[PDB]
Amino acid sequence: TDQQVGAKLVQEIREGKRGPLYAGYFRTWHDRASTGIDGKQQHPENTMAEVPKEVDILFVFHDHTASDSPFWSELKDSYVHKLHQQGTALVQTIGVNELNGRTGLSKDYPDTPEGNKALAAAIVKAFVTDRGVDGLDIDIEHEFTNKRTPEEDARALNVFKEIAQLIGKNGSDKSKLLIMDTTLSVENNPIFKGIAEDLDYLLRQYYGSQGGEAEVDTINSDWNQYQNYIDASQFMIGFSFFEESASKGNLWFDVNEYDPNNPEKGKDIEGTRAKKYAEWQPSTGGLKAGIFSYAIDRDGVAHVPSTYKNRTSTNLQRHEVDNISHTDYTVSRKLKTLMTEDKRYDVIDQKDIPDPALREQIIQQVGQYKGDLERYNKTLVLTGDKIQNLKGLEKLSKLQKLELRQLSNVKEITPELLPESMKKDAELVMVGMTGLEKLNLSGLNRQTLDGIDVNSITHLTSFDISHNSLDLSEKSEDRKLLMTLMEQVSNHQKITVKNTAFENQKPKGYYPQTYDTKEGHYDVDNAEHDILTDFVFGTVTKRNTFIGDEEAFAIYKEGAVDGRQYVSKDYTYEAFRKDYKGYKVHLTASNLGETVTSKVTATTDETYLVDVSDGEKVVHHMKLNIGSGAIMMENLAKGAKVIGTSGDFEQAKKIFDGEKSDRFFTWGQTNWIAFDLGEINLAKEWRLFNAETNTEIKTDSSLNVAKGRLQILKDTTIDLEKMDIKNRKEYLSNDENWTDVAQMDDAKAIFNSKLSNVLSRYWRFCVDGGASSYYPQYTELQILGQR
Ligand SMILES: CC(=O)N[C@@H]1[C@@H](O)[C@H](O[C@@H]2O[C@H](CO[C@H]3O[C@H](CO)[C@@H](O)[C@H](O)[C@@H]3O[C@@H]3O[C@H](CO)[C@@H](O[C@@H]4O[C@H](CO)[C@H](O)[C@H](O)[C@H]4O)[C@H](O)[C@H]3NC(C)=O)[C@@H](O)[C@H](O[C@H]3O[C@H](CO)[C@@H](O)[C@H](O)[C@@H]3O[C@@H]3O[C@H](CO)[C@@H](O[C@@H]4O[C@H](CO)[C@H](O)[C@H](O)[C@H]4O)[C@H](O)[C@H]3NC(C)=O)[C@@H]2O)[C@@H](CO)O[C@H]1O
Ligand SMILES: [Ca+2]
Numbered sequence: 001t002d003q004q005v006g007a008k009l010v011q012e013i014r015e016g017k018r019g020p021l022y023a024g025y026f027r028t029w030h031d032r033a034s035t036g037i038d039g040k041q042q043h044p045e046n047t048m049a050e051v052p053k054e055v056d057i058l059f060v061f062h063d064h065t066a067s068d069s070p071f072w073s074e075l076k077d078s079y080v081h082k083l084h085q086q087g088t089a090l091v092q093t094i095g096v097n098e099l100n101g102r103t104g105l106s107k108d109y110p111d112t113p114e115g116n117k118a119l120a121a122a123i124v125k126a127f128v129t130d131r132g133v134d135g136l137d138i139d140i141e142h143e144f145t146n147k148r149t150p151e152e153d154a155r156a157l158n159v160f161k162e163i164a165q166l167i168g169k170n171g172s173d174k175s176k177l178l179i180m181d182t183t184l185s186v187e188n189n190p191i192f193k194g195i196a197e198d199l200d201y202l203l204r205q206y207y208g209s210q211g212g213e214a215e216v217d218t219i220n221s222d223w224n225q226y227q228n229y230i231d232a233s234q235f236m237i238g239f240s241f242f243e244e245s246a247s248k249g250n251l252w253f254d255v256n257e258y259d260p261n262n263p264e265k266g267k268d269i270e271g272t273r274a275k276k277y278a279e280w281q282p283s284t285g286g287l288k289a290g291i292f293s294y295a296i297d298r299d300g301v302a303h304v305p306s307t308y309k310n311r312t313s314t315n316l317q318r319h320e321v322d323n324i325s326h327t328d329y330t331v332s333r334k335l336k337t338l339m340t341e342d343k344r345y346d347v348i349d350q351k352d353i354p355d356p357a358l359r360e361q362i363i364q365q366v367g368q369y370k371g372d373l374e375r376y377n378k379t380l381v382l383t384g385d386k387i388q389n390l391k392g393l394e395k396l397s398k399l400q401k402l403e404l405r406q407l408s409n410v411k412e413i414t415p416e417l418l419p420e421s422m423k424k425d426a427e428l429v430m431v432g433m434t435g436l437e438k439l440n441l442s443g444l445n446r447q448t449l450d451g452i453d454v455n456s457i458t459h460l461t462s463f464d465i466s467h468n469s470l471d472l473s474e475k476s477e478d479r480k481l482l483m484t485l486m487e488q489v490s491n492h493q494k495i496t497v498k499n500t501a502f503e504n505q506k507p508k509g510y511y512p513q514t515y516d517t518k519e520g521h522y523d524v525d526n527a528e529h530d531i532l533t534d535f536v537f538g539t540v541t542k543r544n545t546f547i548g549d550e551e552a553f554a555i556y557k558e559g560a561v562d563g564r565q566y567v568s569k570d571y572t573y574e575a576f577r578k579d580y581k582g583y584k585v586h587l588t589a590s591n592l593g594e595t596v597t598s599k600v601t602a603t604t605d606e607t608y609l610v611d612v613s614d615g616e617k618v619v620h621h622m623k624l625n626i627g628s629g630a631i632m633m634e635n636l637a638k639g640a641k642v643i644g645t646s647g648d649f650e651q652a653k654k655i656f657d658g659e660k661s662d663r664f665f666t667w668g669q670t671n672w673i674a675f676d677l678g679e680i681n682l683a684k685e686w687r688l689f690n691a692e693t694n695t696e697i698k699t700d701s702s703l704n705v706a707k708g709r710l711q712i713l714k715d716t717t718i719d720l721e722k723m724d725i726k727n728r729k730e731y732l733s734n735d736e737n738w739t740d741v742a743q744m745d746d747a748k749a750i751f752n753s754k755l756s757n758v759l760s761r762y763w764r765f766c767v768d769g770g771a772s773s774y775y776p777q778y779t780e781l782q783i784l785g786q787r
Contacts, residue, residue: 007175020339024296076132120162135177164198208252232286266302344371353392711738713762
């Protein structure tokens with residue numbers, strides 16, 4: 001049956017039985033059975049029927065072919081059968097607009113759960129079942145003209161998942177492939193992030209140069225993120241053949257240029273981008289799935305010369321290679337041969353990994369190809385008593401976690417059996433190692449022994465953990481672990497330095513995670529002090545052993561187990577300690593005034609709140625008292641009700657929030673705001689944040705308030721809410737009803753001064769002039785006191 005042939009091809013593709021794959025996009029209007037809207041034949045020169053066996057998957061790429069064309073029944077009842085016989089699968093390609101509302105059956109279904117689920121079945125019946133093919137390929141490109149909305153990409157991804165529940169590896173009908181082709185990186189491809197686990201392949205178009213000396217910069221950088229969503233064996237990269245009459249913007253130069261002296265040049269793969277994609281392999285994960293070509297019906301046509309690369313549809317510059325001609329698919333077949341003869345696709349054999357039980361678990365976990373070995377960068381779990389020998393493990397040189405579970409017949413672990421990534425902090429877990437006789441981890445810069453199950457190593461006869469980065473100090477848990485290893489050796493043998501080697505550690509230095517002083521003190525000694533020196537200092541080991549300064553390190557360097565000193569003699573404090581570069585100290589005085597400085601001078605009774613930062617986060621918070629300290633003032637003006645202003649009433653209310661992301665000005669050089677602190681407390685200072693402190697607009701200092709007066713309602717015996725709106729406003733505007741408590745005659749960015757213990761419920765601040773002719777502005781006002 002023709003549906004069982006197709007089902008079995010898809011299963012042998014999906015299970016990786018084909019080696020490196022080669023795919024091609026065949027443009028429907030270049031099949032000879034294709035007819036346009038007027039019912040006339042478009043091009044007689046080529047036909048899908050002649051696509052060679054070297055093409056593993058053939059993508060029906062549809063345009064210009066009318067819906068009543070003979071092409072469609074010809075494909076269904078003739079092309080599918082001829083191509084299946086040689087082992088070629090047919091896949092239908094549709095654009096994303098057929099899923100997101102913009103085109104086709106998408107326009108006839110609501111954007112609801114039951115609506116998108118009915119749409120999905122309608123797409124699978126219209127584009128897969130009714131056309132006879134072996135799967136579906138969703139084309140997702142950058143739309144530079146009218147971007148897709150977040151709601152459209154959300155719908156396309158919900159429809160795609162409903163499709164993936166019908167066909168593909170997770171679908172009801174696993175005899176069909178489900179594929180995506182794209183031009184978008186992961187950061188720009190939310191549909192890919194959502195559907196990736198349901199894809200057989202991702203086809204990444206990379207026509208033309210992708211940057212850098214080898215022109216593959218974008219391929220390498222993009223693979224670094226695709227590898228978190230798909231396996232390398234699902235990754236296909238694409239080049240394009242030369243399309244006739246291609247204009248600027250569609251001229252990739254992926255194949256060789258026309259040569260008037262050699263009519264066959266277009267079939268020569270030497271020097272082409274196509275050949276480079278054929279040989280390109282990812283740095284991590286595995287070997288790629290293969291390559292694909294756009295416009296496979298143009299296989300072998302020489303590219304139009306570089307001199308023509310500026311032609312456009314209005315500026316036609318026709319060349320000989322724009323003619324249509326019969327192709328015999330030689331370039332395709334050379335590229336497929338180059339890939340299947342590349343020795344990185346030879347299968348891992350016993351010469352790579354001698355132990356059969358080890359070889360089987362590796363192939364099962366990292367892939368089947370020799371080339372997969374040195375690229376794989378994830379986790380390897382090895383289990384059971386059938387593994388006798390770890391030879392070959394060292395070829396997994398990017399392995400990120402090695403996990404040895406109950407390997408009861410392994411006798412030897414040495415650096416030379418281990419991945420080279422073990423020297424750069426790959427994880428190493430080994431449990432139930434009851435047969436282990438030699439445990440050599442020397443020279444691997446291991447920072448702890450965590451994950452090594454030392455209680456289980458009951459047959460140990462020697463170990464070497466020397467030349468690592470361990471902290472074997474008295475309380476380190478790595479010294480407990482070392483002690484068990486030494487006891488294991490001793491049950492079989494007299495302990496010697498060689499069979500229990502652990503010297504020459506060089507433990508790395510880290511920042512302490514917390515600091516002890518929550519409340520510091522200084523006398524009023526009229527001297528300068530450094531808060532980082534005195535309170536936020538030092539370095540820990542990975543096991544949180546604190547070393548405060550260079551003399552604490554010298555004692556540390558003399559640590560010994562049984563009189564054997566385990567720290568390298570030439571390890572220096574400079575190489576161990578953290579330098580604290582870029583650390584910054586934020587101080588808040590009892591003022592509520594703020595400064596950034598690690599130095600304080602103890603001239604008077606004060607209290608700062610200290611926030612220590614490393615350039616990114618707050619590492620430490622403490623209070624510092626100088627002398628007997630000082631009580632912390634509050635901003636009593638916080639949230640003060642505005643009761644009157646010569647400006648706008650709701651711009652005025654923003655000078656009493658907490659922020660500087662706003663500005664208050666009026667049309668002119670003078671204004672006033674009158675406010676009510678509500679309760680009636682004691683005020684000692686005031687602070688004005690001038691125009692240039694604005695955190696929402698870069699504001700220059702020429703807009704700063706330069707003259708002003710802060711005032712108190714002079715008569716306390718008056719009910720301001722018994723006056724009516726208009727009288728109230730003119731009372732508040734009349735200067736003889738206000739007493740000054742503070743002047744300002746400098747256009748500082750932040751202005752602060754003290755008040756003679758002012759007790760007032762009602763206040764008014766007046767801008768009397770600006771730093772320039774511009775309207776003066778300011779962002780925030782504070783009245784600082786107690787209660
Ligand atoms: C995976 C990939 O490679 N992606 C893109 C490639 O697409 C791209 O190659 C180009 O592809 C063009 C077609 O693009 C279609 O797909 C993309 C991507 O999905 C869409 O963005 C695009 O909009 C196209 O989508 C198609 O839309 C139609 C309409 O909505 C759909 O048809 C609908 O189908 C439904 C369901 O079946 C329903 O039936 C509707 O009724 C129906 O309307 C269709 O399904 C959909 N297809 C897909 C797959 O989604 C190509 O056009 C372009 O090739 C042209 O240009 C090159 C040179 O640059 C030529 O070599 C080539 O032959 C072709 O030229 C055109 O030829 C026709 C036939 O002769 C000309 O028509 C005649 O021209 C005369 C000229 O005087 C008259 O005007 C006459 O009236 C007319 O009949 C036509 O004018 C020619 N046009 C030009 C410009 O020359 C190319 O292959 C590549 C770019 O390299 O980029 C990849 O990223
Ligand atoms: Ca404000």
